[PDB]
Each structure stands twice: as C-alpha cells, then as structure tokens.
Ligand binder design. Sequence first.
Ligand code: MG
Lengths: 100, 97, 39, 205, 43
Amino acid sequence: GFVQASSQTLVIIPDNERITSNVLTTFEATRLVAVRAQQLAINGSTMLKKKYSSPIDIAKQELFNRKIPLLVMRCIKVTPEGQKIVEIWNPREMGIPLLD
Amino acid sequence: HDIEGLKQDFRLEVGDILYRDVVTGDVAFFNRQPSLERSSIGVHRIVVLENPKISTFQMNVSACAWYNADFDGDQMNLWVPWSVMSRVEAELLCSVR
Amino acid sequence: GEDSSMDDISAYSSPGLDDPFSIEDVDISLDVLDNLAPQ
Amino acid sequence: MAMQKLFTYIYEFIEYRKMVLLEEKVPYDKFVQMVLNTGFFRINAETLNHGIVSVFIFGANGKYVHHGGDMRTLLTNTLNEKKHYEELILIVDKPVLSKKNILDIIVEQRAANPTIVINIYPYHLFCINIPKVSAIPKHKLITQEEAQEFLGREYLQPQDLMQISASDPPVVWLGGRPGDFVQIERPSETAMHAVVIRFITKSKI
Amino acid sequence: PSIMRRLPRKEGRIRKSLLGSQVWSISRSTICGNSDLHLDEVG
Ligand SMILES: [Mg+2]
C-alpha cells in the first residue's frame, strides 16, 4: 500500500498567538549552545567581539549576548489533513535560564 | 594518524581533529551501579593525580551521597566526553550541582 | 527382571516462577557485584 | 440492610438528578412487601425535557434475576408501554451482574430498542449519597460548546483526554452518557486543588 | 539454536544489545576518599 506518508505544510503560528513560554528551557538553551558550538567547530565564523579559545565559550557568550544565529521551533501539532502547526521563537529575544 | 608515526613536515591544519590527553578541569561522567536515582550519573571536574602509584577514583566523602557509595570496595565508572555536543550537555545539564 | 542393562540412568543420580534472589532485572556488571555488599 | 439504604438513597438519587417523581411515595414496609411479592419495585420520574425515567429495584430472591424469560417479558412489556421513555435503571443484586443470561437479555433489549438507554446497576451504587462521599471529588458535566472551546485552545481531540466510564458512580449520579465531558475539580496536595476534564466512554455492563 | 531464542531474556537481543551497550572510551576503578577535592571534582 501507500507506505510513503504525504508531505506536510509548515504552519507557523503568528507571533501574537504563541502560547508557549518566552523563556528558554534548560534543555533548549543546552541544545542551542551545543549546536552552535559544533557549527563553530565547523566554520569558526562568529560576530562575537571578545576572543575565546574554545567553541563552547564562544557559543555560551553568543547566547548570553543575544547574538546566536539560531531559531527554536516548537512543534505544536500534526493535523491529519497535512498541516504541521509549529511555533518559531527567537532566542535573541527570549529569557535565558540559569546556566551556571 | 598516530603521533609516533608522524611525518617530518606534519603540522596542524584548520579542520583537523586533535585527540589530546585528559587534563585538570575537563568534565567527566561519574557512575555507580546500580543506577537507581538520576544522580547516579553525575558530571565532575577532573583533577588528574600526578602520582603514578595511584589507581583509584578519588572523590570527596560528601559526594558519596549522590551515588549511595562508600569506600569498602565500591567500583565506579568514568568516561570523559570527547564530543563538543556531549561536553556542552555535560557541564550545562548533568553537572552535580 | 534381574537385568541391569536397560535400567533408567536418571534413577541412579536421583534421591529416588521468578527466582526471588536472582538479579535478572538488575543490569549490573558481574565484576562490580561488591557494590551490593551490605557492609 | 441494603433495602433500607436503597429506599432512601434511590429517592436521593432521583432528586440529585433533578427529576420530579410521578407516583406517590409509599412507606418502607409496603415497599419491602411489594419487592417480596411482586418481585420488584417501580419508581417513575420526569426529567426537565419531559423524558420519563423508570427505576426497577429487583429483589435478590425474585424470579426476574434467576430466569431470563421473566426478565425478557418484563422488559419487552415495559418498553412497549406508550410512555416517553429515555432511561431505565434496573437495580439488581451484585451476583446478578455475573449471570450471563440476564445480561444477554439486557443487551438484546438494548439492540431491539436503540434510542432508549438501558442500564443495570448493583445495589451499592444507590446505598449512599454518592456525591457527598468524602473521597469522591466534585464532578460536573460540561456542555459540548465549552468542551469544544477548551479542546480547540489545547489543540486536542476528544480521544486524547483521560476517559471515564459511564457506569462510574459519580457519573451515574450525574447522568453522564458516552460522548459527554465531565469536569472534575479535585483536591491536590501540591497545588491545593486541580481541574481535569474527562471524556465519558461506554458503560462496562 | 534458533532465531527467536536470541530475543527474549536479559542476555537476549533486546535487553543486552538494544537497551544497553558495550562502549569504548570508558574507565572503571575502585573509589577512594579524598578530603582535598571539591564536591564537584573527581580525582
Ligand atoms: Mg560497599
């Protein structure tokens, strides 16, 4: 039979209708820093001003200084008509948890 | 390439991966079995013991409460994250604080 | 009736559901079992 | 002493469900006399939307619970009576719930009468004022429009909610039907109280 | 030996190979006390 599931269309909730929190979870901040540190290990191209000798410190400082070039997508629902309703959050405009 | 089989004209180039020794300040996961609570695996900062006659994992007695451990002959596992992603997760999520 | 050639062999080495003490659902190494010592 | 408790709390159950009694209430002595001789006691009530609800209390030694023919005859004649029936409650002793033949007559009368709700309940379900039991949180049926608004805000389907049987004693005293939603306000030792919404499913018997 | 005998028990496919793992880059030793180490440090 039709094993292949049909393609989905990405439905982005307008920014004034988002229901999830404006504060990053510790999981999300850790994921952002890990992903960005791996990207820097790939390229090394950053807009951070101060010099750091490791990708991890550059990633944390980019998150803390609100310069991280990543977006958080929170998948809210998969409609059985084909839509994938998600929320897009900008970590540069979000609260940052206690990463100590 | 191994470091003892390394060429005369060899040098580090941007994009190479250097596998270096574990130094003081590195993070490591510390585990005692059976792993019954979620503090049974915790991330500690490594202090390397330069004395060549020491084969034991050493820790503060107040850290034993995380692992239900004591010093009658318990053995514990230790692995050091080498991946960047796992190193970030170790110090931001799994640190014993 | 006196033959012994076809005697039951299991009738010599004989007098005539979970194991409560088995670590079956405990995923612990066998070289570490001293961590279970009562002390 | 199940008969004594029933004689009071069945009428408390009728009042809690917001119905008007149709006959004059008889005293308890002749209630037991009618249960022992006639084999059952019949209580009729009128709902706000003019539906008629009849409750049959069957004695534990009566013929209707031991012989399926008598039960089939009684249910056939009562459901053929020209009344605006909407709900029949057959209160039987607990062991009767394990008799396959009686339940077979029950489900066959259900099949022959698809628009009439037929339910058979044990004794203990009407031997208390169930809502006033301390261990029972506050149950309350909610409308389909409010439940739809709640589910729309939550991006949920009715099949994702926690579910509750229609034979649950608080739901029975509410009169909840499968497909309905019951909001339960319950005590919490973490937040001092909580609210959940459950989806009412089919009765077990 | 059979194909489905490999699956069931604690030494079987699912519990020994899938739900657990032999790994590289790991060390084990007897633990010892050291009062000069911080609580978040391991010697
Ligand atoms: Mg010990």
